[PDB]
Predict the structure of Dual specificity mitogen-activated protein kinase kinase 7.
Amino acid sequence: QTGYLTIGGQRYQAEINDLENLGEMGSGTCGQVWKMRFRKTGHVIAVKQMRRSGNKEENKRILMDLDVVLKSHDCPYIVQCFGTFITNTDVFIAMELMGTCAEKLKKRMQGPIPERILGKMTVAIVKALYYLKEKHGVIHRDVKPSNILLDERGQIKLCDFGISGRYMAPERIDPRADVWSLGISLVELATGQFPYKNCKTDFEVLTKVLQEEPPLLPGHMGFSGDFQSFVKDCLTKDHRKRPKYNKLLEHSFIKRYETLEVDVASWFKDVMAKT
Ligand SMILES: *CCC(=O)N1CCC[C@@H](n2ncc3c(N)ncnc32)C1
């Protein structure tokens, strides 16, 4: 429903001019996203703006993503929408403000991200894809580090569903393909290096994926055996032998970080402090 903004129980009748524009965030990968402040509360939020005069293709993608996120109001690992504003000229989609994405944390850190953090990250992302395949029959089709968002309070959510209904897997080029993309992302963040960084064209990446063996987590960085095993599983070329989430969620690596307390909130704020 339009016109209402609800930040945690408290619902507020509001309109666009009840918000102060604090500047844009990054690029318009799905839409133009502003950081905005609620003049009544003081709360600052992310607001995506869709202009009705905008690109027809981008607008179809923004509506799909919204469709998925309103459906996912009860997944703690998918960013929550706080409400919508519909004016004669624009649609304003209020999202909870996250910090940044794993891609930019990799930039800031200038090196590997510790297994402790990638652990909590694997739990939140696998359960997100599982919740999305089970309760709604959607699959993501674009899981990559720029789509994994974090915040200062430790939360790790998944964010961009604009091309999602029902980093590319071998059988998505040559017929659980979101399982492959998660593994490529995990190897990138774990080593700080993208495993197909020397390819000068898109098709050259696709030939590497099908011709050479999967990128494996190296053995000399102290990675635990469970983490190495989990990545080897996701990075199975033959999709017939790749596990579904019900089997993935029973992996020991998943089980270690469901229970273990990992202070990602502190690790996040220190990385962001370093320039
Ligand atoms: C890699 C992260 C990044 O640069 N982007 C693209 C720009 C928009 C940004 N972003 N999208 C939704 C967001 C929410 N809800 N909070 C914070 N940043 C957000 C992701």
